Amino acid sequence: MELSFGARAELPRIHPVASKLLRLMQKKETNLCLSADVSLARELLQLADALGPSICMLKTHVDILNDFTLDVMKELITLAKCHEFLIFEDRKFADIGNTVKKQYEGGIFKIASWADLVNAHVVPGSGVVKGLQEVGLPLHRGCLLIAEMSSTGSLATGDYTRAAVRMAEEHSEFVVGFISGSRVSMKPEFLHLTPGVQLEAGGDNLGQQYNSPQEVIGKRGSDIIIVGRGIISAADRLEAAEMYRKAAWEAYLSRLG
Amino acid sequence: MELSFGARAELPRIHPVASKLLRLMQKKETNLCLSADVSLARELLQLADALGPSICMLKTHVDILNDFTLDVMKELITLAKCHEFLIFEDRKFADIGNTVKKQYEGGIFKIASWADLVNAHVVPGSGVVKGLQEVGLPLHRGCLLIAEMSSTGSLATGDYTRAAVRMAEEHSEFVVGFISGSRVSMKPEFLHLTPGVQLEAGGDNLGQQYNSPQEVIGKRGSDIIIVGRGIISAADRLEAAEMYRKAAWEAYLSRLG
């Protein structure tokens, strides 16, 4: 009863952004999201161009880009369209609804104008989603809810994770899935994206913890791996991305049987 | 055994940023933080100048400022120095440590260069604080942890709130207090700042809930009220700020006896 990405793209209740994503994952044989955690626009764009064919999604932190402009993001959209990947701004909205709507639409980043996907913490209660969706529904955007975190001491466990799943499942006109370590919803209309991924065991010195693509996708049932330093600190980022793509894709196929 | 703000400023374990704040609160008879939730730099600066004498702190959301530049923030520092208030960027850092350090120091906002105080959600675990403090300790900054939220459905309750208090109390070289609805720590070295404040009962249509300064300061034991729309939507923002200042200050005095 587990469906391929291409069949999930057709589910009756699928969000159009999720459907677009699932179709390109199936087409390109990729369930890799690049975490493009760089500070230079040129590096961001060169990574997006070279790695675009290997990825289903490019995750940004626009607020670490020392030379952000909206024209950078126009360039990034051109590459996303060319290579067929979604743009996910990993802003982690986490305020009351009236504040996050402004943070999403406005200021100098105008996130909603260029990001297919954003994400939110569930700690404020469902007003965080209601505020975002007042901006994002008109613009045909989607949102991911942070149900679990990869870092040591995370409080996104137990009843908190359950609250995130309920909040999704109840805002499914806008919420398309989760940031999580594992499959947290049994409804196949929801995407699961998992950060904290490297091929080798380890972590960082600021609480990051790594698990492998086989563990995350194959054993824990997630859909997509989010990989930053495992790719971006490598010398050859293209070959690193291909290693991660092949790992995540085979883990998905093997789970699917 | 409850101490005045001026005596708390002298406590052995007080953080220098908390001490500076407590001294100016005592001097100016203000425990009001203006939530300057505007999109124009000119309005931000005109509010800071006119209301500066009435406030202990000005809370920003730099990411909704349509015409942000670092020169705006230089102007804002000049006013903070003139009128004696701290600048609190309400960024709600909420990522792994390695990410938040970059978000705090870098990008176009360079938050650490101008904000006396920032805040963080505790959901990622203590690496969020460790990452921020790698930037903020050298720059002699402070941080507030979000222990409770004002909005409907908040998950910052129970064991989550307790985890926030522990995390503070254990990073007290950098963490100076809390965003909370009430006094959550019994240690008087920690500040309690409470949003969701208006004189009249009510809320908004996106989950905000209001309580009065007398309730928050006088009954719930908080130190500082954070007020946005109750001031900024009023016609005369100066008189509105004075009403809130007088309310919060008298509630503090009456609690102190």
Ligand SMILES: O=c1cc(O)n([C@@H]2O[C@H](COP(=O)(O)O)[C@@H](O)[C@H]2O)c(=O)[nH]1
């Ligand atoms: O639980 C979570 C949620 C995240 O978004 N992230 C993000 O995913 C990326 C992980 O990067 P890296 O692979 O270099 O550790 C970072 O951008 C981080 O902000 C995470 O690491 N853990």
Ligand SMILES: O=c1cc(O)n([C@@H]2O[C@H](COP(=O)(O)O)[C@@H](O)[C@H]2O)c(=O)[nH]1
């Ligand atoms: O629990 C919390 C935490 C906050 O920082 N805030 C912030 O405090 C301010 C409240 O503004 P207002 O008084 O207009 O409702 C907003 O900037 C909001 O982001 C809040 O309302 N509740």
